[PDB]
Amino acid sequence: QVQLQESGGGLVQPGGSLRLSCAASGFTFSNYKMNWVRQAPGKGLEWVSDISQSGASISYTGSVKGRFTISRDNAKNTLYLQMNSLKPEDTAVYYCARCPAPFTRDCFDVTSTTYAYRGQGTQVTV
Amino acid sequence: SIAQARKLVEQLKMEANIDRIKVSKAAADLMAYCEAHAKEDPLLTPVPASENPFR
Amino acid sequence: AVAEIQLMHQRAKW
Amino acid sequence: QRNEEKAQREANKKIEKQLQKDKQVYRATHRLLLLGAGESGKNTIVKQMRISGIFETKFQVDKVNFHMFDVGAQRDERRKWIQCFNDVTAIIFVVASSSQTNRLQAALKLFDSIWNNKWLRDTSVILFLNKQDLLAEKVLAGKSKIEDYFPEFARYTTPEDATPEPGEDPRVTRAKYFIRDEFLRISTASGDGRHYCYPHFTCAVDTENIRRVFNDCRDIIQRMHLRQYELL
Amino acid sequence: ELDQLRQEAEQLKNQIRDARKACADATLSQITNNIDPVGRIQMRTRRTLRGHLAKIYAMHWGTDSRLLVSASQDGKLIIWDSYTTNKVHAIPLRSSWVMTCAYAPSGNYVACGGLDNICSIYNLKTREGNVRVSRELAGHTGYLSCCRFLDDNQIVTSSGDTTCALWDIETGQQTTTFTGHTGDVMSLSLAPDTRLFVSGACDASAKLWDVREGMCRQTFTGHESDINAICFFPNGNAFATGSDDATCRLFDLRADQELMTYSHDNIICGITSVSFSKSGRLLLAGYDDFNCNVWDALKADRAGVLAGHDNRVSCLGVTDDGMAVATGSWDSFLKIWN
Amino acid sequence: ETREREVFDRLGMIYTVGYSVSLASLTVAVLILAYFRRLHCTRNYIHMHLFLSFMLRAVSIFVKDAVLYSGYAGCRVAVTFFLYFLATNYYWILVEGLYLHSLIFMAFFSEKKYLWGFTVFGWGLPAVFVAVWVSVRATLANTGCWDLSSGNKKWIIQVPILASIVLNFILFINIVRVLATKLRETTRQQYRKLLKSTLVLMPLFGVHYIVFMATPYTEVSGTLWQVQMHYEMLFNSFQGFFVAIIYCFCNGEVQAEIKKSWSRWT
């Protein structure tokens, strides 16, 4: 069963740094693209970052460029979001999402309200 | 979300309550079915052109 | 003019 | 049994003539998938072009039939039913240009996923940025501050060929063409010439819209023809 | 408490995993070690059914194993006499976005559904002889991805609203609803006794549903991505699933766990359609690479390839008598194979 | 005066070799097109007609050479068939241009409205003016093999052919224009691809005629006559070969069909 369990989210002073981690189970980590999404209090799901299969191709949303850094560890099947220079608007539930198919370029639906291959999420309060 | 979580917990309880036979028994049953019905399978054992409706 | 036709005509004349 | 064979062949021929007529009608009409968010002004565009799990709008421009599909009453997980629209002539895309902490980012990701999807990689897209008046109102009032939602706006300069509209403020032109250039950065990357994009700055109530799609659809058809001769 | 429910759910999942591990005393590969390989299955195309304009999205064989309905997104249901390739009916659809079709077991009716979220039942035996919508079943809140008749008055449908529904055609009302999938149900298959049915969804899971009671008896996991196709093994105590992770997997209902997996490195495209042969020894899976593979269901070795389609193979069907296979494709042709 | 005899013999050899190679390649190409059912399309139907016209031109030229150069009815009908199967090839090249122009500049083409019209145009307007010429020649001259020219009767066939050379040039550049716009609205690669498209469209549209289209009946002794005859013989003889190479053998779809058939046969 596709499981994505996150950890590391918690209260942090503004301007701080926090390492969100994502343990993946039930699928071949290296074959699928990965994405970090967030849900702010009272807001909809917002796409934050993504990293491709090999880990060479990285993209961030505009509001987090230069601050957050995504990474993947295929030998340990995990995903990292290193957050730096955190802001009060960064308070949200962060979900470790997955692309719906392997070796595939389109990552459709990772921000859907009832998405399937998405983690439970960890809350980050700033 | 509380109702959905309760429904999921109930479903998992019902799924855990069911009994499961040994895998060897199920594999033996599938093998037995395959052996009993192999000769009724035109795709596995080709039919002649006379019998083949798509000749 | 037309190549093939003019060649055939000049072959004719000669 | 030969009587049954004759009856079946007569039925087949009566079916085949109707299939010939239906093929004539089908090849003479173009299917447009109209896709866009709820507040993107898409419904206003449908209302202009006009005046259930899917809404079909038939319209005719220059004696040419277009069939535009507004896909309502569906869930937001589009990765399955979108594959139905790989044989449409064009996917009209309506983007809320002057607009979830970042809605335009979600629109850009949707366009990217459409562009890179293996079945839609042959289907071309018509792009409508349907919030030009609202974009002008926002950027002229100084409430834009786009350089933090998209940091690229801190260094982007208007390309030389980007002709601003008459009487239009430079900020409005720069913002609208910055959005266009984001969509083009997605589209020109791995485009490979198999499908194309037509960015158009539209208002919600423009009468030009039915023409724009026309002049896009026609172009698409021509390119497909030029693809068959190995010219493109 | 939501946290208490989550903890209990995790404990139940761990208990289920431990029970499945305990029941897995032997592997199917070890059990079938004494069975000789089937060799190479060289099937060839015997009929090519032409007439559809757009991509053919579904087909379904008749119980006579001779007639078959095919749905194309040009807005057409065409009923072929596959022996003679002569079309029997050409039914124009109200909505041209059809994603599934079914042929009634008695042959009196056909069904179709799609992006209109409506199941249309067409009567092939009207007084005049034409084909008209006998019944229009509305009520799904998502596209209809599959539908299967139980009889002339009841039909089971799977929709994109993550739920399945059993409809009473006479009254038009929903007799039963099945909920529990978190992704769209992409295919369903009725058991030979039609008392249970398995539905594969876009949650990378299949679910066995009791039609009489409406409850989900078992949930089968192991696939990594969206499951596009599903079908019972002919005995009714097992089934197979094809998914976007490019691997087929055969599960069984009584061990409640995976039996065996059909995958290959050269295959990276997902499976759009699966169907067993009459004995179940062959598992036929249609792929996005325009090919259709024939797997030795007991050895996992690929025994054949049904190459010949110019576009994505969207639908498969093995006749009730097992004589022939039929594959539809996005290139708008059905091919019959022997 | 054996010099002109040697010149005519050399011309005969060069277009004999050219037409032999072209006829072989075009027969192979038309067999390939007819064999594969997937390739059946309006464009490929018109290409098959063009290939048939090229084949008929080559075989008719060979027949005329055998009958005439190795005043009865057989010789006259051989000359008439030579002229007819030349004019049909010219008008099928014009039909190539007309169909490619209609696909693009006409907003949305309608196959049923024009395909039969294009076919009857390409096979019959040459027939119409060849029949008119035959009637005029039989009524007013009716001498020899009709191989000799009789006043201004010859133009009855030559003038209508030349017009198809005119218009099909006007089409050609215009298409080369529109591709430029297609390459403009979407650099070194742009102009390189435009040049490639022009070069591959060179043989289908028969543009090389326009160079010597307007030259009148030149005297045999002269450098202009020699260059015109040799250039036109070589280019016309190998034009069918080039068309078959480009539009069948080098075509991506046809190569895909050939490779798939070979792989499945293996």
mmCIF file of N, CA and C in Angstrom, chain B residues 1-2 5-6 8-16 18-31 33-35 37-45 47 51-55, chain E residues 2 5 8-9 12-13 16 19 23-26 28 31-32 35 38 46-47 82-83 216 218-219 233-235 250 252 254-257 259 277-279 281 321-325 336 338:
data_model
loop_
_atom_site.group_PDB
_atom_site.id
_atom_site.type_symbol
_atom_site.label_atom_id
_atom_site.label_comp_id
_atom_site.label_asym_id
_atom_site.label_seq_id
_atom_site.Cartn_x
_atom_site.Cartn_y
_atom_site.Cartn_z
ATOM 1 N N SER B 1 -14.290 14.843 8.554
ATOM 2 C CA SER B 1 -13.147 13.937 8.597
ATOM 3 C C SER B 1 -13.309 12.878 9.679
ATOM 4 N N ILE B 2 -14.005 13.207 10.769
ATOM 5 C CA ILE B 2 -14.222 12.237 11.838
ATOM 6 C C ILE B 2 -15.045 11.060 11.330
ATOM 7 N N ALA B 5 -12.870 8.905 8.998
ATOM 8 C CA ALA B 5 -11.940 8.093 9.775
ATOM 9 C C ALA B 5 -12.651 6.949 10.483
ATOM 10 N N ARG B 6 -13.843 7.202 11.028
ATOM 11 C CA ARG B 6 -14.608 6.137 11.667
ATOM 12 C C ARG B 6 -14.979 5.055 10.662
ATOM 13 N N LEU B 8 -13.354 4.308 7.895
ATOM 14 C CA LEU B 8 -12.136 3.581 7.551
ATOM 15 C C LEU B 8 -11.757 2.590 8.646
ATOM 16 N N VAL B 9 -11.885 3.001 9.910
ATOM 17 C CA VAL B 9 -11.565 2.107 11.022
ATOM 18 C C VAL B 9 -12.520 0.919 11.044
ATOM 19 N N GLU B 10 -13.812 1.175 10.823
ATOM 20 C CA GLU B 10 -14.779 0.082 10.772
ATOM 21 C C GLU B 10 -14.453 -0.890 9.646
ATOM 22 N N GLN B 11 -14.110 -0.364 8.468
ATOM 23 C CA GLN B 11 -13.781 -1.227 7.339
ATOM 24 C C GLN B 11 -12.542 -2.061 7.629
ATOM 25 N N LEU B 12 -11.522 -1.452 8.238
ATOM 26 C CA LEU B 12 -10.327 -2.213 8.589
ATOM 27 C C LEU B 12 -10.625 -3.272 9.641
ATOM 28 N N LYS B 13 -11.508 -2.972 10.596
ATOM 29 C CA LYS B 13 -11.908 -3.981 11.572
ATOM 30 C C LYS B 13 -12.586 -5.163 10.891
ATOM 31 N N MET B 14 -13.525 -4.886 9.982
ATOM 32 C CA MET B 14 -14.194 -5.971 9.268
ATOM 33 C C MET B 14 -13.208 -6.770 8.423
ATOM 34 N N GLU B 15 -12.258 -6.091 7.780
ATOM 35 C CA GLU B 15 -11.261 -6.784 6.974
ATOM 36 C C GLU B 15 -10.333 -7.644 7.820
ATOM 37 N N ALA B 16 -9.996 -7.196 9.031
ATOM 38 C CA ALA B 16 -9.151 -8.002 9.903
ATOM 39 C C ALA B 16 -9.921 -9.166 10.514
ATOM 40 N N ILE B 18 -11.993 -11.176 9.050
ATOM 41 C CA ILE B 18 -12.171 -12.310 8.152
ATOM 42 C C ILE B 18 -10.993 -13.265 8.280
ATOM 43 N N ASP B 19 -11.259 -14.548 8.061
ATOM 44 C CA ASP B 19 -10.216 -15.561 8.090
ATOM 45 C C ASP B 19 -9.653 -15.778 6.691
ATOM 46 N N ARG B 20 -8.381 -16.160 6.636
ATOM 47 C CA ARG B 20 -7.677 -16.365 5.379
ATOM 48 C C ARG B 20 -7.128 -17.780 5.333
ATOM 49 N N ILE B 21 -7.378 -18.475 4.225
ATOM 50 C CA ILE B 21 -6.819 -19.805 4.038
ATOM 51 C C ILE B 21 -5.351 -19.693 3.644
ATOM 52 N N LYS B 22 -4.649 -20.818 3.720
ATOM 53 C CA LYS B 22 -3.237 -20.837 3.373
ATOM 54 C C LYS B 22 -3.058 -20.569 1.882
ATOM 55 N N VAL B 23 -1.949 -19.912 1.533
ATOM 56 C CA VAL B 23 -1.693 -19.577 0.133
ATOM 57 C C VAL B 23 -1.482 -20.841 -0.690
ATOM 58 N N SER B 24 -0.868 -21.864 -0.094
ATOM 59 C CA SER B 24 -0.660 -23.115 -0.813
ATOM 60 C C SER B 24 -1.981 -23.740 -1.242
ATOM 61 N N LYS B 25 -3.007 -23.668 -0.391
ATOM 62 C CA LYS B 25 -4.319 -24.196 -0.753
ATOM 63 C C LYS B 25 -4.909 -23.461 -1.955
ATOM 64 N N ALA B 26 -4.822 -22.130 -1.964
ATOM 65 C CA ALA B 26 -5.370 -21.360 -3.076
ATOM 66 C C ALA B 26 -4.592 -21.617 -4.360
ATOM 67 N N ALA B 27 -3.265 -21.707 -4.259
ATOM 68 C CA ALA B 27 -2.456 -22.018 -5.432
ATOM 69 C C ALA B 27 -2.796 -23.397 -5.977
ATOM 70 N N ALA B 28 -3.000 -24.372 -5.086
ATOM 71 C CA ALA B 28 -3.411 -25.700 -5.520
ATOM 72 C C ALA B 28 -4.765 -25.665 -6.210
ATOM 73 N N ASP B 29 -5.713 -24.887 -5.685
ATOM 74 C CA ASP B 29 -7.021 -24.789 -6.329
ATOM 75 C C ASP B 29 -6.934 -24.149 -7.710
ATOM 76 N N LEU B 30 -6.143 -23.084 -7.855
ATOM 77 C CA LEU B 30 -5.973 -22.475 -9.173
ATOM 78 C C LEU B 30 -5.307 -23.436 -10.150
ATOM 79 N N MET B 31 -4.288 -24.169 -9.694
ATOM 80 C CA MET B 31 -3.657 -25.168 -10.552
ATOM 81 C C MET B 31 -4.657 -26.237 -10.967
ATOM 82 N N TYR B 33 -7.921 -25.959 -11.234
ATOM 83 C CA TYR B 33 -8.839 -25.398 -12.219
ATOM 84 C C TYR B 33 -8.184 -25.323 -13.592
ATOM 85 N N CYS B 34 -6.922 -24.888 -13.639
ATOM 86 C CA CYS B 34 -6.226 -24.791 -14.918
ATOM 87 C C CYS B 34 -6.098 -26.159 -15.575
ATOM 88 N N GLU B 35 -5.735 -27.179 -14.795
ATOM 89 C CA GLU B 35 -5.615 -28.518 -15.364
ATOM 90 C C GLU B 35 -6.964 -29.063 -15.812
ATOM 91 N N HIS B 37 -9.520 -27.374 -16.926
ATOM 92 C CA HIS B 37 -10.097 -26.632 -18.038
ATOM 93 C C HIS B 37 -9.119 -26.311 -19.160
ATOM 94 N N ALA B 38 -7.911 -26.884 -19.151
ATOM 95 C CA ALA B 38 -6.947 -26.596 -20.211
ATOM 96 C C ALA B 38 -7.465 -27.007 -21.584
ATOM 97 N N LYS B 39 -8.094 -28.177 -21.684
ATOM 98 C CA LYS B 39 -8.530 -28.676 -22.985
ATOM 99 C C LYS B 39 -9.763 -27.961 -23.520
ATOM 100 N N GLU B 40 -10.382 -27.080 -22.739
ATOM 101 C CA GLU B 40 -11.505 -26.274 -23.193
ATOM 102 C C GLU B 40 -11.084 -24.870 -23.603
ATOM 103 N N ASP B 41 -9.785 -24.634 -23.794
ATOM 104 C CA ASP B 41 -9.240 -23.303 -24.058
ATOM 105 C C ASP B 41 -8.657 -23.272 -25.464
ATOM 106 N N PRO B 42 -9.411 -22.788 -26.451
ATOM 107 C CA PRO B 42 -8.884 -22.703 -27.821
ATOM 108 C C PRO B 42 -7.669 -21.801 -27.953
ATOM 109 N N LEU B 43 -7.616 -20.731 -27.158
ATOM 110 C CA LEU B 43 -6.479 -19.817 -27.218
ATOM 111 C C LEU B 43 -5.190 -20.493 -26.772
ATOM 112 N N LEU B 44 -5.249 -21.272 -25.693
ATOM 113 C CA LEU B 44 -4.071 -21.991 -25.225
ATOM 114 C C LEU B 44 -3.756 -23.186 -26.118
ATOM 115 N N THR B 45 -4.777 -23.945 -26.505
ATOM 116 C CA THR B 45 -4.622 -25.095 -27.396
ATOM 117 C C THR B 45 -5.344 -24.785 -28.700
ATOM 118 N N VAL B 47 -7.350 -24.400 -32.087
ATOM 119 C CA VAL B 47 -8.381 -25.183 -32.761
ATOM 120 C C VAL B 47 -8.018 -25.326 -34.234
ATOM 121 N N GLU B 51 -12.819 -26.170 -37.101
ATOM 122 C CA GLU B 51 -13.511 -25.744 -35.890
ATOM 123 C C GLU B 51 -13.441 -24.237 -35.686
ATOM 124 N N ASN B 52 -12.344 -23.604 -36.102
ATOM 125 C CA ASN B 52 -12.116 -22.178 -35.903
ATOM 126 C C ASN B 52 -13.200 -21.360 -36.596
ATOM 127 N N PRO B 53 -14.084 -20.698 -35.842
ATOM 128 C CA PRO B 53 -15.137 -19.891 -36.476
ATOM 129 C C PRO B 53 -14.613 -18.680 -37.225
ATOM 130 N N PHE B 54 -13.389 -18.240 -36.946
ATOM 131 C CA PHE B 54 -12.773 -17.116 -37.635
ATOM 132 C C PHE B 54 -11.731 -17.563 -38.650
ATOM 133 N N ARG B 55 -11.979 -18.668 -39.341
ATOM 134 C CA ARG B 55 -11.053 -19.208 -40.326
ATOM 135 C C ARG B 55 -10.869 -18.257 -41.503
ATOM 136 N N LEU E 2 -10.011 11.467 16.435
ATOM 137 C CA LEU E 2 -9.384 11.248 15.136
ATOM 138 C C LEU E 2 -8.000 10.626 15.273
ATOM 139 N N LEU E 5 -8.538 7.039 16.222
ATOM 140 C CA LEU E 5 -8.954 6.278 15.050
ATOM 141 C C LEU E 5 -7.776 6.002 14.127
ATOM 142 N N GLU E 8 -5.670 3.251 15.726
ATOM 143 C CA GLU E 8 -6.348 1.969 15.579
ATOM 144 C C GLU E 8 -6.269 1.465 14.145
ATOM 145 N N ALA E 9 -6.416 2.366 13.171
ATOM 146 C CA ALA E 9 -6.324 1.978 11.768
ATOM 147 C C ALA E 9 -4.929 1.471 11.431
ATOM 148 N N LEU E 12 -4.598 -1.985 12.912
ATOM 149 C CA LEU E 12 -5.345 -2.952 12.116
ATOM 150 C C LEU E 12 -4.621 -3.275 10.816
ATOM 151 N N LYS E 13 -4.038 -2.262 10.173
ATOM 152 C CA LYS E 13 -3.277 -2.503 8.952
ATOM 153 C C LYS E 13 -2.068 -3.390 9.228
ATOM 154 N N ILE E 16 -3.308 -6.917 9.672
ATOM 155 C CA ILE E 16 -3.649 -7.500 8.376
ATOM 156 C C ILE E 16 -2.386 -7.929 7.640
ATOM 157 N N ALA E 19 -1.073 -11.087 9.252
ATOM 158 C CA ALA E 19 -1.883 -12.245 8.883
ATOM 159 C C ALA E 19 -1.569 -12.706 7.465
ATOM 160 N N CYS E 23 -0.025 -16.317 6.269
ATOM 161 C CA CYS E 23 -0.677 -17.205 5.312
ATOM 162 C C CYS E 23 0.198 -17.520 4.106
ATOM 163 N N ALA E 24 1.228 -16.719 3.842
ATOM 164 C CA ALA E 24 2.069 -16.932 2.669
ATOM 165 C C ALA E 24 3.168 -17.948 2.947
ATOM 166 N N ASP E 25 2.790 -19.209 3.162
ATOM 167 C CA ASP E 25 3.776 -20.250 3.426
ATOM 168 C C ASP E 25 4.507 -20.712 2.172
ATOM 169 N N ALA E 26 3.880 -20.618 1.002
ATOM 170 C CA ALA E 26 4.496 -21.055 -0.240
ATOM 171 C C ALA E 26 4.181 -20.047 -1.334
ATOM 172 N N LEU E 28 3.532 -19.052 -5.465
ATOM 173 C CA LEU E 28 2.913 -19.652 -6.643
ATOM 174 C C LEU E 28 3.966 -20.175 -7.611
ATOM 175 N N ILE E 31 4.878 -23.466 -6.253
ATOM 176 C CA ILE E 31 3.772 -24.404 -6.416
ATOM 177 C C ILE E 31 3.655 -24.854 -7.868
ATOM 178 N N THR E 32 3.773 -23.923 -8.810
ATOM 179 C CA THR E 32 3.688 -24.234 -10.231
ATOM 180 C C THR E 32 5.033 -24.620 -10.832
ATOM 181 N N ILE E 35 4.819 -27.462 -13.449
ATOM 182 C CA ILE E 35 4.026 -27.267 -14.657
ATOM 183 C C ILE E 35 4.930 -26.798 -15.789
ATOM 184 N N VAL E 38 4.072 -23.036 -21.335
ATOM 185 C CA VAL E 38 3.181 -23.141 -22.484
ATOM 186 C C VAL E 38 3.878 -22.865 -23.807
ATOM 187 N N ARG E 46 -7.559 -12.346 -37.339
ATOM 188 C CA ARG E 46 -8.482 -12.982 -38.265
ATOM 189 C C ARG E 46 -9.517 -12.025 -38.836
ATOM 190 N N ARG E 47 -9.941 -11.023 -38.069
ATOM 191 C CA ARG E 47 -10.892 -10.034 -38.552
ATOM 192 C C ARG E 47 -10.426 -8.655 -38.118
ATOM 193 N N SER E 82 -18.918 -10.390 -35.647
ATOM 194 C CA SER E 82 -17.482 -10.557 -35.829
ATOM 195 C C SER E 82 -17.134 -11.659 -36.820
ATOM 196 N N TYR E 83 -18.032 -12.622 -37.037
ATOM 197 C CA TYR E 83 -17.775 -13.659 -38.031
ATOM 198 C C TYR E 83 -17.736 -13.068 -39.434
ATOM 199 N N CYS E 216 -18.021 -3.719 1.438
ATOM 200 C CA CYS E 216 -16.758 -4.147 0.849
ATOM 201 C C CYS E 216 -16.184 -5.285 1.682
ATOM 202 N N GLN E 218 -13.434 -7.339 1.060
ATOM 203 C CA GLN E 218 -11.983 -7.351 1.158
ATOM 204 C C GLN E 218 -11.413 -6.214 0.326
ATOM 205 N N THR E 219 -10.239 -5.740 0.728
ATOM 206 C CA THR E 219 -9.494 -4.736 -0.018
ATOM 207 C C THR E 219 -8.117 -5.292 -0.339
ATOM 208 N N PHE E 233 -10.400 -14.312 -12.392
ATOM 209 C CA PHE E 233 -9.970 -15.603 -12.890
ATOM 210 C C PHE E 233 -11.202 -16.499 -12.994
ATOM 211 N N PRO E 234 -11.271 -17.377 -13.997
ATOM 212 C CA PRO E 234 -12.547 -18.046 -14.296
ATOM 213 C C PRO E 234 -13.171 -18.826 -13.143
ATOM 214 N N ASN E 235 -12.417 -19.217 -12.112
ATOM 215 C CA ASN E 235 -13.049 -19.982 -11.043
ATOM 216 C C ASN E 235 -13.848 -19.103 -10.094
ATOM 217 N N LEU E 250 -1.885 -10.802 -10.124
ATOM 218 C CA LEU E 250 -2.970 -11.730 -9.852
ATOM 219 C C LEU E 250 -3.092 -11.914 -8.348
ATOM 220 N N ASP E 252 -5.830 -13.344 -5.085
ATOM 221 C CA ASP E 252 -6.856 -14.337 -4.800
ATOM 222 C C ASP E 252 -7.714 -13.878 -3.629
ATOM 223 N N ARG E 254 -9.367 -15.677 -1.308
ATOM 224 C CA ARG E 254 -9.404 -16.473 -0.090
ATOM 225 C C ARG E 254 -8.143 -16.377 0.751
ATOM 226 N N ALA E 255 -6.995 -16.077 0.153
ATOM 227 C CA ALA E 255 -5.811 -15.730 0.921
ATOM 228 C C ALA E 255 -5.721 -14.237 1.205
ATOM 229 N N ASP E 256 -6.554 -13.425 0.548
ATOM 230 C CA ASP E 256 -6.592 -11.977 0.748
ATOM 231 C C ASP E 256 -5.219 -11.343 0.553
ATOM 232 N N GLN E 257 -4.490 -11.784 -0.468
ATOM 233 C CA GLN E 257 -3.166 -11.242 -0.729
ATOM 234 C C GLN E 257 -2.779 -11.535 -2.168
ATOM 235 N N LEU E 259 -1.130 -13.132 -5.267
ATOM 236 C CA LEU E 259 -0.546 -14.419 -5.615
ATOM 237 C C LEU E 259 0.713 -14.264 -6.448
ATOM 238 N N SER E 277 -7.961 -16.035 -20.519
ATOM 239 C CA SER E 277 -8.500 -17.027 -21.429
ATOM 240 C C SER E 277 -9.544 -17.870 -20.700
ATOM 241 N N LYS E 278 -10.135 -18.822 -21.426
ATOM 242 C CA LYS E 278 -11.220 -19.607 -20.847
ATOM 243 C C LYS E 278 -10.753 -20.439 -19.662
ATOM 244 N N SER E 279 -9.575 -21.055 -19.758
ATOM 245 C CA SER E 279 -9.039 -21.828 -18.646
ATOM 246 C C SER E 279 -8.351 -20.961 -17.604
ATOM 247 N N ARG E 281 -5.278 -19.944 -17.982
ATOM 248 C CA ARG E 281 -3.838 -20.150 -18.073
ATOM 249 C C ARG E 281 -3.138 -18.955 -18.702
ATOM 250 N N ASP E 321 -16.939 -18.506 -25.029
ATOM 251 C CA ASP E 321 -16.476 -19.830 -25.417
ATOM 252 C C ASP E 321 -14.962 -19.910 -25.554
ATOM 253 N N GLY E 322 -14.259 -18.786 -25.435
ATOM 254 C CA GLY E 322 -12.814 -18.791 -25.503
ATOM 255 C C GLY E 322 -12.237 -18.965 -26.885
ATOM 256 N N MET E 323 -13.059 -18.871 -27.932
ATOM 257 C CA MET E 323 -12.558 -19.077 -29.286
ATOM 258 C C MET E 323 -11.589 -17.979 -29.698
ATOM 259 N N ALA E 324 -11.956 -16.719 -29.482
ATOM 260 C CA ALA E 324 -11.200 -15.612 -30.042
ATOM 261 C C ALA E 324 -11.038 -14.501 -29.020
ATOM 262 N N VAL E 325 -10.004 -13.694 -29.231
ATOM 263 C CA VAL E 325 -9.789 -12.457 -28.491
ATOM 264 C C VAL E 325 -10.219 -11.315 -29.394
ATOM 265 N N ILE E 336 -9.790 -9.008 -34.220
ATOM 266 C CA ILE E 336 -10.067 -10.319 -33.649
ATOM 267 C C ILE E 336 -8.817 -11.165 -33.814
ATOM 268 N N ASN E 338 -6.774 -15.039 -33.078
ATOM 269 C CA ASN E 338 -6.745 -16.456 -32.725
ATOM 270 C C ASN E 338 -5.311 -16.972 -32.673
#
